[model samples]
Target: MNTDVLNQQKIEELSAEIGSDNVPVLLDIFLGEMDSYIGTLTELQGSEQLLYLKEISHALKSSAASFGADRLCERAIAIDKKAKANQLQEQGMETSEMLALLHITRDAYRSWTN
Candidate 1:
């Protein structure tokens, strides 16, 4: 499986940091959280307020990093930064890019354990 979005090294390192036995529990929560987060994100896509995107992406970025979804983390951060700066149409970020990354990351996570 292509783990381009997931930082396997970071995942393993953090698992070791947190303890080996708890990894599965953490993973389960991470997976569930991804679905909920993405669902909210998709809803926000049709929203008029830019702040919603900024705030959610900002929060998502922090959470994503903890679980080692490096690319997802980066993309979320970019969206958050751009949205917060009110530069969505600028070079800061494209909403589609973030959405694409999220979809890919979600697919990878869904398939990873199954």
Candidate 2:
């Protein structure tokens, strides 16, 4: 199940695209941005700032893909679409899941490096 959290193939492709040594640099940037986004989203969780939620999730969606964090990417996509569509209630529930997914994705990647 942890393996499903990240697409090994995608990670390989990324390493191939940019030498192996550079992969960590890219991932480092992604993780930093991801953490910042998560913190902001967590603070805005119950607020009426749906647009802010959409923006952060949208950013997370794309960044997660670059790192092969498939589960996190999918969760971000769901959150993005829900917020975009103004489905407040569902968006809230999905947002909660999004937070958990972010942490899981982060842990998975961190674990892999360890």
Candidate 3:
């Protein structure tokens, strides 16, 4: 299935599982955390801190899963693994592509939820 449809299905499922009122609160918290993570990414990029990027990406991967953002989480995990393994230099272009995909995914999620 398309990522947007999958995301919507996950949201609806979570809402049913946890109740609709709670979903908004949960979403707010998730988005807030994501914003912080993005800030971390920006900082790491500026500092050229591979270790910090890896750590932050690891955190992002786990948190994204809780919101059923599997694809985003997967990309983060891949990036984290690449950095941890000191393979990012070889995968820099791919990493950039994944980052672009992540931005598209986030926009998709925001538009859907709003």
Candidate 4:
């Protein structure tokens, strides 16, 4: 399925390297990591800690993309780049949309039942 949400192509690559049966194992591992990304990013935003949040967002971008969560990957890139430029408030991104994308990608990964 060519969904706008998940990066099926990337998932396909992993399935090729490790077979479909093992994809779930890797995805579950990443899901756990993404959770930590979400929690830390949220806390950082609440604390008005932009410097570290920038770093975490970039990390989340790379990690999420490897798992085929396109939306999460996109949001993470936006947050990382904008924050690096110190333009998040100017761009009107208060982390709520990015957080939603994080939760959405987590649920999307959780739905892997192949």
Best by lDDT: 2
TM-score of each: 0.40, 0.47, 0.43, 0.42
Model 4, runs deviating above 4 Å: 1-6, 18-60, 64-92
lDDT of each: 0.49, 0.52, 0.49, 0.49
Model 2, span 10-105: residue lDDT tens? 555555656256657655665566556556854766432443354345544444556556654665566445663345445454454445444655
Give the range of the ten consecutive residues with the poorest summed lDDT in model 4: 47-56
Candidate 2's TM-score: 0.47
Q: In angstroms, how far off is 68's CA in candidate 4? A: 3.4
**For candidate 2, what is the lDDT?**
0.52
Error of 1 at 12 (Å): 1.2
List residue ranges in candidate 1 displaced over 4 A: 1-6, 17-45, 48-59, 69-72, 79-95, 110-114
Candidate closer to the true structure by TM-score (higher is better), 1 or 4: 4
Clashing pairs in 4: none
Task: For model 2, give the 10-residue run with minimal summed lDDT.
Answer: 46-55
- Candidate 3 stretches with Cα past 4 Å from truth are 1-5, 17-59, 79-102
